[PDB]
Amino acid sequence: KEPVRFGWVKGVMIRCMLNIWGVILYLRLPWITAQAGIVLTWIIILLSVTVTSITGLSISAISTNGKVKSGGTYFLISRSLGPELGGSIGLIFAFANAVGVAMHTVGFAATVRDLLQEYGAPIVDPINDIRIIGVVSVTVLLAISLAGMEWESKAQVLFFLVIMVSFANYLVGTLIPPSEDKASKGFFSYRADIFVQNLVPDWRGPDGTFFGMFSIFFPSATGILAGANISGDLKDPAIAIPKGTLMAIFWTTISYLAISATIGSCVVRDASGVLNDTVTPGWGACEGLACSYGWNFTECTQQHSCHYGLINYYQTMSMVSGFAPLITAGIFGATLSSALACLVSAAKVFQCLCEDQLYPLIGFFGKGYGKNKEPVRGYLLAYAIAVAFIIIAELNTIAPIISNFFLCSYALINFSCFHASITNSPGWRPSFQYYNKWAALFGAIISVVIMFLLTWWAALIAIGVVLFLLLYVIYKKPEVNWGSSVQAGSYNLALSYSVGLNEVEDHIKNYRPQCLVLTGPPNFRPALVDFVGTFTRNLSLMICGHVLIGPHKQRMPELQLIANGHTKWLNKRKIKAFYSDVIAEDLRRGVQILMQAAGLGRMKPNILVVGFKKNWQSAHPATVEDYIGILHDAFDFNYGVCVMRMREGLNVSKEEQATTIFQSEQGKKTIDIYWLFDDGGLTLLIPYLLGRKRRWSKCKIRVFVGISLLSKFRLGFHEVHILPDINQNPRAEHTKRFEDMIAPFRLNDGFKDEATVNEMRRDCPWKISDEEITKNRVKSLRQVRLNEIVLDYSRDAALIVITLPIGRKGKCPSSLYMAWLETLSQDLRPPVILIRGNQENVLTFYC
Amino acid sequence: KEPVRFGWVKGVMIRCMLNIWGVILYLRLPWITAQAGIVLTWIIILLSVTVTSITGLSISAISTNGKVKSGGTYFLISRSLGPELGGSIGLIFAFANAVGVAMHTVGFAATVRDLLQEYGAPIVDPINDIRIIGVVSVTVLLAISLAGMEWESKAQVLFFLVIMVSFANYLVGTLIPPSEDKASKGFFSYRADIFVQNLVPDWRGPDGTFFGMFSIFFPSATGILAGANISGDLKDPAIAIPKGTLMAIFWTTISYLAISATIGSCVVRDASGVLNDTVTPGWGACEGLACSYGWNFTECTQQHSCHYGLINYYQTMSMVSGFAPLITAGIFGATLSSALACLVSAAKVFQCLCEDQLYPLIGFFGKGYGKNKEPVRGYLLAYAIAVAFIIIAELNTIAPIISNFFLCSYALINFSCFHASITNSPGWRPSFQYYNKWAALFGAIISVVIMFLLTWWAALIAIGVVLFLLLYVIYSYNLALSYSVGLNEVEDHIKNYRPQCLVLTGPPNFRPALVDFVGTFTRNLSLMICGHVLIGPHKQRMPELQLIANGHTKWLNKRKIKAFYSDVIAEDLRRGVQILMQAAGLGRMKPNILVVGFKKNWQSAHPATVEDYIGILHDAFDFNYGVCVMRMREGLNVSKEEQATTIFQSEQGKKTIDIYWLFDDGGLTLLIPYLLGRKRRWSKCKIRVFVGGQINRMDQERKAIISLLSKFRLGFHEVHILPDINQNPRAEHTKRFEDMIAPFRLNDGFKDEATVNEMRRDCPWKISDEEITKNRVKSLRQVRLNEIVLDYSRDAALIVITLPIGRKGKCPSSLYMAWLETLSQDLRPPVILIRGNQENVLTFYCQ
Amino acid sequence: NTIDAVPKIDFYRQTKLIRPTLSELHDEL
Ligand SMILES: Nc1ncnc2c1ncn2[C@@H]1O[C@H](COP(=O)(O)OP(=O)(O)OP(=O)(O)O)[C@@H](O)[C@H]1O
Ligand SMILES: Nc1ncnc2c1ncn2[C@@H]1O[C@H](COP(=O)(O)OP(=O)(O)OP(=O)(O)O)[C@@H](O)[C@H]1O
C-alpha cells in the first residue's frame, strides 16, 4: 500500500506533451501558415523552440545533482540559488499556474459555447455561458485532483489518446479525394503548384506581420516544466526528467512542423464556398490555380470579400478532416489537460514553499493529508483563485501579465545553471553532461529581451513584483542553510582577491595599522573591541585573539561550536573582526603562537593591543613576569604595542549586547597627546585616524612635546605646547606612594655582587636589587613626575595618549617596569592609551 | 585668505526660490487655469508639490547626518548601495544639470529674439539668432560664475529683486479698473460671477486633459536640490538646509496658488480683441457673460475664432499688469537665475566626481585651479556640454529624456534613505524630527511611477543608460579585506566543502614535486599554504628574514603557483608544525589537510627523528586534520636561470589512477583524485577503484559499490574486488619485513607493562614483545596488500592507498613507520596515502 | 565502536551503523 510512483513515459513525457499542446494547433497554426508561408512559419517554430530547448537542458542539468524531492521547480531553483532568489519566484510560479487554470478553462468554455449556440438554444447571453460552463468544469477538475494522484494519470492518458485520434482523423482526411462541399471551400488534396505558390509570405490585415505571428505562436511552445513539477511522485527523477522533458520537446516540435507543411500543400488561400462557382467554358480567362482544378474564385479574390480558405476561415482544419467532431474532441482534450496540469502543479509547488517558512501567515496551506500527504488545502486555494478569474471572463489583457510571470521563471532556471557552473564548487557534479555554460547565459538574457519585446508594460509588473518579494526576504534573513552556489561564490571571490595580493611587493607607501587584539572571549571585555574597531574599520585588519589555558591540546569538534558562537557575537555588533583561538599551557606562549603564525600572506598583524593588569598587586608575582614578557616578545617580533587602561576595568564578566563608551558621541572635549619619543609615528597616527570619524570629529587634539616637524605630515594638528618641567622632585607624598608600592618586590641585600644577587634572584626573577634601584632613579622620578602634569592638563579630557616606556632587558626587572606602567596612569577620568611604535616611518603618507 | 560662507536665507532659500521659479509661472498658469479651472489646478499643484516635499524631507534628513563637501548628493547612494550606482547616478545628475543650462539659455534667447524682431529688424535667420544669443549669454554666465562665489550670489539676488517687482506690478495692475482697450481683450476687475464661472474645467484642444496639464506643470516644480549642492560653502549645513529647502517649497507653492486663483477671478476665457463691439439694445440677445459689462463676444463664442482671452492668448499677464515691460524683465530674471543655478550645481558635482577616489571613470579630465578653490575644471566641462546642446538647438525631443534623469536621481535618493534605515546600517543615524522611512519609500515608488506615466519611451532610455554605465565600471588590499570579512556571514555546508592544504615543503625550491602536485587540484579551487620551519633558538625577527620570505614568494610567483608562504621559528620541527596548524589562516580560510613527504632515510637516521616524524601525524590527527603522505622512488628533495621540471608538469596521457579504497574515511581519498582529474593533464586518465570483500559475495558487493559510487556522481570507470586480502604473504617477504623491524625490537622476554616502561622511558620508539605478537595479523595484512598493489598497479600514473592509523600508545613509532614503508616500496609511480578525519565530504542530497 | 569500517552505504544516508569517530580509533583506551 505504498504510494504509487511513476515511470518516465507516464510521469514526465506524457504530461509535458499534453501541456505543450494547446489550441494553436487547431485554430491558429493554419492561419499562421497562410500569412507567413511555410518557410517563415518553420523559422518561427525553430526560433521559438530554441529558447525552450535551452531551458530544458538547464533544468535537466540542475535536477541531476543530488536527490530531488516533493517540491517541483521551486525546489530545484531554491536549492541551487538560495532562499532569496528561489523564494521570490516560487511564489509567482504558483500564482501564475493558478491563473493559467482559469485561462485554460475559459478556452474550453468558449468552444462549448460555440458548439451549443449553433445547434440549439443557449442558456443565457454569450458571456454568462462562459461563466456557468467554466465554473462547472473547473469543479470536476478539482474533484479529479482531490480523488488521488492515480486518477489524474488516467485522465491524462485518456486526453492523450483523444489527441492522437484527432491527429489520425485529420491526416486520414487530407488524403481522400475532395468532395464538392470541400473543393468549393478550397481543399484540393496535395498538389505541387499549390505547395510552391504557398512557400512565400502573403501578409494581409492589421496583425499580419512577422512579429505579429511570433507573438501569437511563442507562448504556445512553452509550459515544458509540468512533469518536473511532480518530482515527489517519480521513481528516479535524476533519470526520468532529462529524458521526458527533451523528448516531449522534440516530438511536439515534429508535430508543429508537420501540421503546417501538410495543411499548406492542400488548401488555397482564397476561396468562396459557393457550389455554383464551378468554371464555365468560354468565360474568357479566369484567376488563380483553382482554375486548373475547375473552380472559379475571380470575383472573390478581386473584390476582397470571400469567407473561406486558409487565410480567411479559422476552422479549415475541421473541414479537411474525415469527420469533424473528432477535431472538437481533440480541442477539448488539449485544453482540459493543460488546465489539470496547471492545477496540480500550483498546489505541489505551494506546499513546498509553505513548509520552508520564508513568508508570513501562509503556513496553513502546507499541511499534508492522508498517506501521500497531498495538499488538500492548496487545491482549494488554487480553486478559489481560478474561479475568481473565471468570473471575470475577459482575460485578453490579463494574459500578457501571466505569460511574463513564466518567462521570468525561464530566466532564473537558466541563471541557476550558469551560476552553478561558473562557480564550480567542489560538490557540483551533475550526471547530465550535455549542457553548456554560455548557452545557459544566452538563454537568461534572451528570456528578458523577449519579455520586453512581447509587452513593455507587463515586464515591468513582473520585475517589480520579483524585486518586492526578493527584498522582503533579504531584509528578513530567514535562517535556512541549503548548500547554494551563492554561498560558494563568496569563498571563490575571497580567495581570488586574497591571492592577488601576492603579486605586489612590500613598499613604504602602503603602511597600514594591522592589529592583533587580546580580548579573550570577545564579550568579556567589549571595550577593546569597540576602541579598536573604531579606527581600523574599512582600513586594515583586526584579529581578536584568545588563549585557552590548559594542559590538553585536542580540537574536539565542540571547540568549533564555541568559536562559531563567538564569531556571531561580532557579526551582530557589526564589528568587522576575525576571531582566532589557540591552545597553550600559559598565556605568554599562546600569544607567541598567535603572533608567529596568524594572518595570510601579506595581510598579517603588526600591532599588539592588550589591556591592563588591574590586579597586579594581588595576583601571584609569577603572573607579572609573563605579562611583561608578552610586551618584550612583541618588541622582539618587531611589533608595536598599545596598553589600554580604564578606571573601572575592562572585564565585564566579573541575550542583549552590552554598551560601552566608545559607541557614543564624545562632544567638544579634547584628545591630549604627550609626544615624548620619535617612535616613528604610531603615537600620532592612532589619534589622527580615530578623531577623523564622526564621533570624534568635534574634538580638538593637542599634541605636547618634551613646529615644522608636525607640519610636513599634514596631520591637521591643532595645538602644540612645551611641557613645563619634566625633571624635578615632585611632592614627597607622591614619592613615598611610589616607594611603598614597590617595597614588597625588594630584595634588601644592601649592596652585593651582581652574581651573588642572581644566586637568589634565580628562583624569583622579579625581585629588585638595591643596585638596580640606585642606577635607575632619574627615570623613575620622571615617571612619577609626569603623572602630576597629566593630572593638571587633562583632568576632563575624553582620551589621553602617552608614550610607552621601555625597560632595559636584564637591567630592569619585571616588577619595577610594571610599577612604571602603573604610575604613569593612576587616578585619571578618561581612557588612557600607552603607545610605542617600532621605529618605522609610518606617517610617510596620509594613513 | 578667509573662505566665504553664506547664511540660510541667502544660501539655501533664495537659491531654491530662483531654481523653482520658471517661465511656467508667467506663460502657462493662466492657460492651465482657463483650461482646467481653479479647483482642479489647485489639485494639480498640491499633487505635484507632495512629491517634492517628501524628497525634501529625505534630502534634509541626509544633511543632518554628518558633514559633506559640495556635490556629495550621491555620496549616500554610494554608501548604501555601493560605489557603482552612486558614481553613475552622480555622473547622470551632473550631466542633466549641464543640459538644463542649455535649455534655460535657449528659452531666454527665444524671448530676447522675439522682443528684438519687434522694435527693430532681425540681422540674421531666426534659428541662428538663437545660436548667437545663447552662446553669448552662457559665456557671460560662465564669466560671472568663474570669478568667485560672492559675485554669483549678488547676481542671484538682483534676479530675486527683478522677480519680486514683477509680482507687485501684476498685482497692482489687477486692481485698476479696465481701460477701453484692456476690457476689449477680456480683463475686468475682481468680480464674483467670473470666479463662479471659472471654478469648473473647460477642456478644449488636443491637450485638454487633466494629465495633459500635469505633464506640463510637474517638471516645473522640481529644483529643490540647488541649496544642497553647495553644502560645503554653508555656514551651518545641519540647520540651514532643512529650513531653507523646506521654506522655499512652501513659499513658491503659495505664489502658484495665489496667481492661479487671482487671475481666475479676473479675465474671461475668450474675447474678440476689437474695439467696435459696443453693445446697443435691439439686435437679439447677448450670448455670453461679458455682455453684462457692455461687450458683445458672440462672434468668437459660436465660431471658435478669437485670438484673445484666457484660453487663447498666452501673454495675458503682459496686459493684465499695470505695465508690460516689467513682466518681460521678470521673465529674463526667471530664466537666467535657473541657468546660473544649474551651472554651479553641475560644476560642484563634476569636481566632486573628479576628486573621488572610488570612481576613476572621469578622474582624468584636467588640472584645476584651487588657488581660489574654484572648480575650474568642473566649470569648463559644464560650459562645453551647455554650448554643444545650445548649438544643436534640438530641444523638445530631448526634454523628456533629461526630465527622467532627475527622477531616477530622486527615486534612488529616497530608496537609499529607506535601505540604510531598514538595514540598521552602522553610520546612518540622522537627527531630523520629521523623517520616516515609509515616506521615503513612497517617494521612491512614486518617482518611478511618474517616469513611466509622463513619457514611457524616455524612461526606458534613462534606465538603460544607468545600466550601461553601471555594468561598464564593474567589468588590491581593500578588496582582499572586504571579501574576507564577507565570508564571516556565510555558513558551512557539506556541498561547499573545499580541501584546504598545509604543505610542509621547507624551502619551496628543495622539493618542487610537492608544490607541483598540490597546486594542481587546489588551483582556482581552495587555499594552499607552503609551510617552513626554521630550527634555531629564540631568534630575532630580522630584516633579512623578511628578505628571504620575499625571495621565496618571488620564486613561487615565477613558477605561477597560486599559493601562500609562511615560516615560523621553533626549537625543533614538530613544535613549529604545531604552531602552523594552530594559528595559520584567516577566518574561514584555514587549512584542514596536512601534506607531508616521505621520511626516505628512516632506516639509517637517528631513531629519535622517526619519533618526531610520527608525532607530526599524531598531532595532525589530534587537531582533526586529514593527512596525505607522498612518496617517489628517487626522493622528493632535489637539492641533493631555469627552474627544475617535475613529472607533474606534463600531460599524463592514457594511464590510470588506482584508488585502493580500503577503509571509510568520509570520502577524501575519493575526492582528491576526482579534483585531480578535473584538470587538463589528468582528464584522459582512466580511474579504477579497488575494494576489499569476501569471495562468496563478489557480485553482491561489486554491484553495491558501483551503486554507491553512482550516487556520488564521481564518474569512476571500473570497480574491482579483492577477495585474497587475508592470506599469508610469501615467506621471503615476511622475512624482509621482520629483518627491518629488528634494530627497533626490545627483546624483553614477556614482562608486565611496568617492566617494559622501565627500559622504554629513555627510548620510547622500541617495540615490546607483546606489541610484536598482538600486531602480527595487522602487519602481515600490509605485507600482502603491498603484493596486491604491485600486482595490479605496475604502470599507473598515480596510486592512492588509504592510510592506516595506529592507536596512540599501542603502536610504537617504529612499527607504524614500518607499516608505511611496507605499503609502498618497490613501486615506480607516485604513491599518495590519504586518510580523512572520519567526517563526510560527499553527499547524495541537494538540500 | 572501536575497529575501522569498510566502505558502506549506511554511513552516508540520512534517517544505525555510524562510523567510528577519529577520537575512537586514535585516543588511548
Ligand atoms: N585568556 C586570554 N586570552 C587572551 N587575552 C587575554 C587573556 N587573559 C588576559 N588577556 C589579555 O591580558 C590583559 C590583561 O590581563 P589581565 O588578566 O590582568 O586582564 P583581566 O584582569 O582578565 O581583565 P581586566 O584587565 O579588565 O581586569 C587583558 O585585558 C587581555 O587583553
Ligand atoms: N624544515 C621543514 N619544514 C617543513 N617541513 C619539513 C621540513 N623538513 C622536512 N619537512 C617535511 O618532512 C618530510 C620528510 O623530511 P626528511 O627529513 O625525510 O627530508 P626529505 O629530504 O624529504 O627526505 P630524506 O631526508 O629522508 O631524504 C619532508 O618531505 C617534508 O615534507
Ligand SMILES: CN1[C@@H](CSCC(F)(F)F)Nc2cc(Cl)c(S(N)(=O)=O)cc2S1(=O)=O
Ligand atoms: C500554456 N502555458 C504557457 C503560457 S500561455 C499564456 C497563459 F495563458 F498561460 F497566461 N506557459 C506555461 C509554462 C509552464 Cl512552465 C507551465 S507549468 N504547469 O509547467 O509550470 C504552464 C504554462 S501555461 O500552461 O500557462
Ligand SMILES: CN1[C@@H](CSCC(F)(F)F)Nc2cc(Cl)c(S(N)(=O)=O)cc2S1(=O)=O
Ligand atoms: C526645471 N528643472 C527640472 C527639469 S525640467 C527641464 C528639463 F530639464 F527637463 F529639460 N528638474 C531639475 C532638478 C534639479 Cl535637482 C535641479 S538642481 N539645479 O537642483 O540640481 C534642476 C532642475 S531643472 O532646473 O533642470
Ligand code: NA
Ligand atoms: Na493541453
Ligand code: NA
Ligand atoms: Na529661475
